[PDB]
Short mmCIF file of C-alpha atoms and ligand atoms in Angstrom, two decimals:
data_model
loop_
_atom_site.label_atom_id
_atom_site.label_comp_id
_atom_site.label_asym_id
_atom_site.label_seq_id
_atom_site.Cartn_x
_atom_site.Cartn_y
_atom_site.Cartn_z
CA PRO A 3 -0.82 -5.46 39.45
CA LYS A 4 1.55 -7.34 37.07
CA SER A 5 1.77 -6.11 33.42
CA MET A 6 2.99 -8.03 30.31
CA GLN A 7 4.87 -6.33 27.48
CA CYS A 8 3.02 -6.64 24.12
CA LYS A 9 4.69 -6.12 20.71
CA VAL A 10 2.38 -5.44 17.73
CA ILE A 11 3.55 -5.34 14.09
CA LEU A 12 1.57 -2.45 12.49
CA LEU A 13 0.53 -2.44 8.81
CA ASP A 14 3.38 0.04 7.92
CA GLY A 15 5.87 -2.68 9.16
CA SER A 16 6.77 -0.76 12.37
CA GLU A 17 6.48 -2.21 15.93
CA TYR A 18 4.19 -0.79 18.68
CA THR A 19 5.09 -1.82 22.29
CA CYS A 20 2.68 -1.42 25.26
CA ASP A 21 1.90 -3.10 28.60
CA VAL A 22 -1.42 -4.68 29.72
CA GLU A 23 -2.36 -6.36 33.03
CA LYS A 24 -1.40 -10.10 32.55
CA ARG A 25 -5.12 -11.18 32.96
CA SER A 26 -6.24 -8.60 30.31
CA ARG A 27 -8.85 -9.59 27.65
CA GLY A 28 -7.80 -9.09 23.99
CA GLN A 29 -10.10 -5.99 23.69
CA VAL A 30 -7.77 -4.11 26.15
CA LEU A 31 -4.69 -4.46 23.85
CA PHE A 32 -6.83 -3.90 20.68
CA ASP A 33 -8.23 -0.58 22.12
CA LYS A 34 -4.61 0.57 22.91
CA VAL A 35 -3.42 -0.22 19.34
CA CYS A 36 -6.48 1.45 17.71
CA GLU A 37 -5.96 4.59 19.89
CA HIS A 38 -2.25 4.66 18.80
CA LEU A 39 -3.43 4.40 15.14
CA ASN A 40 -6.18 7.14 15.59
CA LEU A 41 -8.63 4.47 14.31
CA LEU A 42 -12.36 4.88 15.15
CA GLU A 43 -13.84 2.39 12.63
CA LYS A 44 -12.34 -0.55 14.61
CA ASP A 45 -15.01 -3.20 13.63
CA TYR A 46 -13.07 -4.18 10.41
CA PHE A 47 -9.78 -4.97 12.23
CA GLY A 48 -8.25 -7.32 14.79
CA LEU A 49 -4.99 -8.67 16.16
CA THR A 50 -3.45 -11.96 15.05
CA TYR A 51 -0.91 -14.13 16.87
CA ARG A 52 0.97 -17.33 15.88
CA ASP A 53 -0.01 -20.48 17.90
CA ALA A 54 2.35 -23.34 18.96
CA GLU A 55 1.77 -24.87 15.44
CA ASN A 56 2.87 -21.44 13.89
CA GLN A 57 -0.71 -20.91 12.50
CA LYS A 58 -2.20 -17.37 12.40
CA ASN A 59 -5.09 -17.06 14.89
CA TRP A 60 -7.38 -14.06 15.57
CA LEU A 61 -6.98 -12.75 19.16
CA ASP A 62 -10.51 -13.06 20.60
CA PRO A 63 -11.20 -9.65 22.19
CA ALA A 64 -13.62 -11.24 24.71
CA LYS A 65 -11.09 -13.84 26.08
CA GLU A 66 -7.95 -13.44 28.23
CA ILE A 67 -4.79 -12.86 26.14
CA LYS A 68 -2.82 -15.42 28.25
CA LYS A 69 -5.40 -18.22 27.51
CA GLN A 70 -4.88 -17.71 23.74
CA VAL A 71 -1.10 -17.06 23.37
CA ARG A 72 -0.69 -19.78 26.12
CA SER A 73 3.02 -20.83 25.94
CA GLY A 74 3.89 -18.30 23.15
CA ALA A 75 5.34 -14.75 23.16
CA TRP A 76 2.98 -11.74 23.49
CA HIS A 77 3.69 -10.81 19.85
CA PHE A 78 0.83 -9.81 17.54
CA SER A 79 0.09 -8.21 14.16
CA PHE A 80 -2.61 -5.59 13.45
CA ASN A 81 -4.72 -6.71 10.45
CA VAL A 82 -7.95 -6.27 8.54
CA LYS A 83 -10.35 -8.98 9.78
CA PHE A 84 -13.48 -8.09 7.71
CA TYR A 85 -12.70 -6.64 4.24
CA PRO A 86 -15.56 -4.20 3.41
CA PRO A 87 -17.10 -5.04 0.01
CA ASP A 88 -17.61 -1.29 -0.58
CA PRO A 89 -14.77 0.72 0.99
CA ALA A 90 -16.38 3.96 -0.34
CA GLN A 91 -18.98 3.48 2.46
CA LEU A 92 -16.39 3.62 5.31
CA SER A 93 -16.88 6.93 7.17
CA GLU A 94 -13.15 7.86 7.52
CA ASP A 95 -10.20 8.26 5.14
CA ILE A 96 -7.86 6.83 7.86
CA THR A 97 -9.92 3.56 7.81
CA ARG A 98 -9.41 3.36 4.02
CA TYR A 99 -5.66 4.14 4.53
CA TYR A 100 -5.17 1.11 6.87
CA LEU A 101 -7.26 -1.04 4.46
CA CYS A 102 -4.84 0.04 1.62
CA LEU A 103 -1.77 -0.89 3.74
CA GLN A 104 -3.27 -4.37 4.44
CA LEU A 105 -4.10 -4.87 0.75
CA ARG A 106 -0.56 -3.83 -0.33
CA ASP A 107 0.76 -6.69 1.96
CA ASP A 108 -1.93 -9.06 0.59
CA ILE A 109 -0.58 -8.28 -2.94
CA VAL A 110 3.23 -8.37 -2.24
CA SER A 111 2.73 -11.62 -0.22
CA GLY A 112 0.82 -13.29 -3.13
CA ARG A 113 -2.37 -13.85 -1.02
CA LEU A 114 -4.23 -11.52 -3.47
CA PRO A 115 -3.31 -12.53 -7.05
CA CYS A 116 -3.37 -9.62 -9.50
CA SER A 117 -2.81 -9.09 -13.30
CA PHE A 118 0.26 -7.12 -14.50
CA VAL A 119 -1.94 -4.10 -15.39
CA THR A 120 -3.74 -4.09 -11.99
CA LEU A 121 -0.42 -4.44 -10.05
CA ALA A 122 0.86 -1.35 -12.01
CA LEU A 123 -2.42 0.58 -11.48
CA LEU A 124 -2.56 -0.18 -7.69
CA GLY A 125 1.18 0.70 -7.53
CA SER A 126 0.59 4.04 -9.35
CA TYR A 127 -2.15 5.02 -6.77
CA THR A 128 0.16 4.10 -3.82
CA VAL A 129 2.97 6.27 -5.33
CA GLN A 130 0.52 9.19 -5.95
CA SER A 131 -0.80 8.86 -2.35
CA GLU A 132 2.74 8.68 -0.84
CA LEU A 133 4.96 10.93 -3.05
CA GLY A 134 2.26 13.10 -4.65
CA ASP A 135 2.54 14.27 -8.28
CA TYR A 136 4.94 12.54 -10.71
CA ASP A 137 8.38 14.27 -10.80
CA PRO A 138 10.92 13.29 -13.52
CA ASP A 139 13.85 14.56 -11.32
CA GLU A 140 13.52 11.49 -8.98
CA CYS A 141 12.78 8.86 -11.71
CA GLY A 142 14.98 8.36 -14.82
CA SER A 143 14.73 5.60 -17.50
CA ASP A 144 16.50 3.23 -14.97
CA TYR A 145 14.21 3.98 -11.91
CA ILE A 146 13.15 1.28 -9.38
CA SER A 147 10.73 2.41 -6.57
CA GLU A 148 11.54 1.54 -2.92
CA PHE A 149 7.83 0.55 -2.93
CA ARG A 150 7.10 -3.15 -3.08
CA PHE A 151 4.17 -3.56 -5.53
CA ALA A 152 4.11 -7.30 -6.39
CA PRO A 153 5.41 -10.70 -5.28
CA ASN A 154 7.88 -10.52 -8.24
CA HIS A 155 9.14 -7.14 -9.53
CA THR A 156 10.19 -6.60 -13.18
CA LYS A 157 11.58 -3.48 -14.89
CA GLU A 158 8.46 -3.50 -17.17
CA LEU A 159 6.24 -3.37 -14.01
CA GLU A 160 8.25 -0.40 -12.62
CA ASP A 161 7.91 1.36 -16.01
CA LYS A 162 4.11 0.86 -16.08
CA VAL A 163 3.73 2.21 -12.49
CA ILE A 164 5.52 5.44 -13.62
CA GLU A 165 3.46 5.73 -16.85
CA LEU A 166 0.20 5.48 -14.82
CA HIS A 167 1.62 7.72 -12.03
CA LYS A 168 2.05 10.49 -14.65
CA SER A 169 -1.74 10.34 -15.38
CA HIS A 170 -2.68 11.04 -11.67
CA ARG A 171 -1.38 14.69 -11.41
CA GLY A 172 -3.38 16.73 -8.82
CA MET A 173 -4.77 13.61 -7.09
CA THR A 174 -4.86 13.89 -3.27
CA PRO A 175 -3.82 11.03 -0.93
CA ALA A 176 -7.46 10.27 0.08
CA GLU A 177 -8.53 10.31 -3.61
CA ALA A 178 -5.65 7.95 -4.73
CA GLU A 179 -6.45 5.58 -1.79
CA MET A 180 -10.14 5.51 -2.83
CA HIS A 181 -9.11 4.66 -6.46
CA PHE A 182 -6.75 1.98 -5.09
CA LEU A 183 -9.70 0.42 -3.20
CA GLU A 184 -12.22 0.76 -6.13
CA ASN A 185 -9.79 -1.47 -8.16
CA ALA A 186 -8.61 -3.83 -5.35
CA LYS A 187 -12.22 -4.62 -4.23
CA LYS A 188 -12.98 -6.18 -7.68
CA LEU A 189 -10.14 -8.78 -7.56
CA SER A 190 -11.58 -12.32 -7.40
CA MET A 191 -9.56 -13.06 -4.15
CA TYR A 192 -10.28 -9.72 -2.36
CA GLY A 193 -10.86 -10.40 1.39
CA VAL A 194 -10.87 -14.23 0.79
CA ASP A 195 -9.40 -16.11 3.81
CA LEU A 196 -8.16 -19.51 2.36
CA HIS A 197 -8.13 -22.78 4.37
CA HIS A 198 -6.57 -26.05 3.01
CA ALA A 199 -9.08 -28.97 3.29
CA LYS A 200 -10.23 -32.29 1.76
CA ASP A 201 -13.77 -32.95 0.52
CA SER A 202 -15.83 -36.04 1.63
CA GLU A 203 -13.87 -38.07 -1.04
CA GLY A 204 -10.34 -37.03 0.20
CA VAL A 205 -9.75 -34.65 -2.82
CA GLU A 206 -7.65 -31.60 -1.72
CA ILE A 207 -9.59 -28.29 -1.98
CA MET A 208 -9.37 -24.76 -0.57
CA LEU A 209 -12.23 -23.22 1.43
CA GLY A 210 -12.42 -19.38 1.16
CA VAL A 211 -14.25 -17.29 3.78
CA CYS A 212 -15.39 -13.80 2.72
CA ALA A 213 -18.27 -11.26 2.82
CA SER A 214 -20.42 -13.06 0.19
CA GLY A 215 -20.07 -16.55 1.72
CA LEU A 216 -18.04 -19.74 1.75
CA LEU A 217 -16.21 -20.57 -1.51
CA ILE A 218 -14.97 -24.11 -2.46
CA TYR A 219 -11.99 -24.04 -4.92
CA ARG A 220 -11.81 -27.66 -6.29
CA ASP A 221 -9.56 -26.18 -9.03
CA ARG A 222 -9.79 -23.40 -11.74
CA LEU A 223 -12.67 -25.42 -13.38
CA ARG A 224 -15.38 -26.24 -10.71
CA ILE A 225 -15.85 -23.48 -8.01
CA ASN A 226 -18.84 -23.99 -5.62
CA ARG A 227 -20.20 -20.91 -3.71
CA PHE A 228 -22.49 -20.82 -0.61
CA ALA A 229 -23.89 -17.30 0.09
CA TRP A 230 -24.36 -16.72 3.85
CA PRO A 231 -28.14 -16.82 3.00
CA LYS A 232 -27.85 -20.44 1.62
CA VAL A 233 -25.69 -21.84 4.54
CA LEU A 234 -28.23 -22.65 7.35
CA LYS A 235 -25.89 -24.29 9.97
CA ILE A 236 -22.11 -24.51 10.67
CA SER A 237 -20.30 -27.00 12.99
CA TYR A 238 -16.96 -28.77 13.70
CA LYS A 239 -16.26 -32.20 15.30
CA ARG A 240 -12.71 -33.72 15.60
CA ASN A 241 -10.80 -33.04 12.26
CA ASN A 242 -14.09 -32.35 10.36
CA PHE A 243 -15.90 -29.13 9.30
CA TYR A 244 -19.62 -29.53 8.27
CA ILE A 245 -21.94 -26.97 6.56
CA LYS A 246 -25.79 -27.40 6.56
CA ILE A 247 -27.11 -25.95 3.21
CA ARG A 248 -30.77 -24.74 3.60
CA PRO A 249 -33.37 -26.68 1.54
CA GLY A 250 -34.11 -25.36 -1.98
CA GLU A 251 -37.78 -24.35 -2.49
CA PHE A 252 -40.02 -27.49 -2.34
CA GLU A 253 -37.07 -29.68 -1.11
CA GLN A 254 -38.02 -31.59 2.11
CA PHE A 255 -34.54 -31.55 3.84
CA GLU A 256 -31.43 -29.41 4.45
CA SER A 257 -28.25 -30.94 2.81
CA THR A 258 -24.92 -31.49 4.72
CA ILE A 259 -21.43 -30.93 3.26
CA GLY A 260 -18.47 -32.30 5.24
CA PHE A 261 -14.81 -31.35 4.93
CA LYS A 262 -11.62 -32.82 6.48
CA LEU A 263 -9.18 -30.27 7.96
CA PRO A 264 -5.48 -31.00 8.77
CA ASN A 265 -6.18 -31.21 12.55
CA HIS A 266 -8.80 -30.34 15.19
CA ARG A 267 -7.38 -26.79 15.75
CA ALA A 268 -7.61 -26.13 11.95
CA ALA A 269 -11.31 -27.26 11.95
CA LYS A 270 -12.14 -25.03 15.01
CA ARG A 271 -10.31 -21.97 13.49
CA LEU A 272 -12.24 -22.33 10.18
CA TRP A 273 -15.53 -22.76 12.15
CA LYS A 274 -14.86 -19.58 14.20
CA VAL A 275 -13.86 -17.33 11.22
CA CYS A 276 -17.02 -18.57 9.35
CA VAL A 277 -19.34 -17.83 12.36
CA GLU A 278 -17.69 -14.38 12.67
CA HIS A 279 -17.98 -13.59 8.90
CA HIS A 280 -21.66 -14.75 8.92
CA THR A 281 -22.51 -12.49 11.92
CA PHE A 282 -20.59 -9.48 10.55
CA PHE A 283 -21.88 -9.64 6.96
CA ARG A 284 -25.48 -10.56 8.11
CA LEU A 285 -25.46 -7.16 10.02
CA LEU A 286 -23.24 -4.83 7.89
C1 GT4 B 1 -22.69 -20.13 16.69
O1 GT4 B 1 -23.11 -20.20 15.35
C2 GT4 B 1 -23.21 -21.53 14.84
C3 GT4 B 1 -23.65 -21.45 13.37
O2 GT4 B 1 -24.16 -22.43 12.83
N1 GT4 B 1 -23.40 -20.26 12.70
C4 GT4 B 1 -23.75 -20.04 11.35
C5 GT4 B 1 -22.74 -19.65 10.45
C6 GT4 B 1 -23.07 -19.38 9.12
C7 GT4 B 1 -24.41 -19.51 8.72
O3 GT4 B 1 -24.86 -19.22 7.49
C8 GT4 B 1 -25.41 -19.91 9.60
C9 GT4 B 1 -25.08 -20.18 10.92
#
C-alpha cells in the first residue's frame, strides 16, 4: 500500500511531515495534523494548498488528496477556515491559541488591517501570553521584540507594546489570548476572505466572505452587505459568480447580482467558500 509524504506548515511556522496512502481523502491528513496539534475543536480549521495557478485552495476533506493537488507537491498549510464571531464560546483554550496564531499572521501579512493602538494592544497580549509578566531586565529604552506584530514595525510601535505589556502583570496565557481575541474579533476585516471581482458594469470590486454574509467593497464609500439570511441562491457559470437575493416583503421576485471573476477556477473557488460559509454559519 503506497504512501505519499505530506508536509504541512503549522501556524507557529514549523513543518509537520507525515505519510498517507496515495488514494487518501483530505480528512485522513487533516485528522493526523489535528491529532499532532492536540486539537479537538477541528470544525473551525482546514488545510490549504497552492494550485497550478499558485492560488490558495481549501483541501476538501471528502475528496482524494491526489485529485486536488493534481500535478503539484503534497505541501499544505494548517489554517483557520471559519473565524468564530465569538471566540469566548469555543470550549478549549488550545482552540483559541491556534486562532490567535492565525490572526497574528493575518495582521503581519496585512490581510487584517489594524490601527496603531490595536496593533500595540494585540502585540502586548501576545507578549504577556508568551513571555509572561513584563521584566525591565530584558527590555531597555532601545528594545525591539523578536515578535512580529505588524506589516511595518516602528520604534514607536515597539514602545507602545511594552507600555501596554506593563499593564498586564499577573495575566495568564489563556487570559491574554482571550483579551487578544476580544479585540481582534471587532476589526472590520476579521475573518473576511477577499476575492477580486468585477461588477455587472466591469468596475473592479472585492467580494468578502465571512460569518455575517457576503460583503461587496466598491471602495471606502459604498459597501453593500448580504446577510446569509438575505442571499437565497448561489451559483457559478464560466467566469461568472451570481447571487440570488430573496424578495423584500411584498416584492414579487428574487433579484440576481452577477459578478465577473478572473477565470473559471476563481468563480468556482468563490462559490465553494460561500456555500461552506453559509452552511457553517447557518448551523453554528
Ligand atoms: C449547494 O448550495 C447552493 C447554494 O445556492 N447555496 C447557498 C449559499 C448561500 C445562501 O444564502 C443560500 C444558498
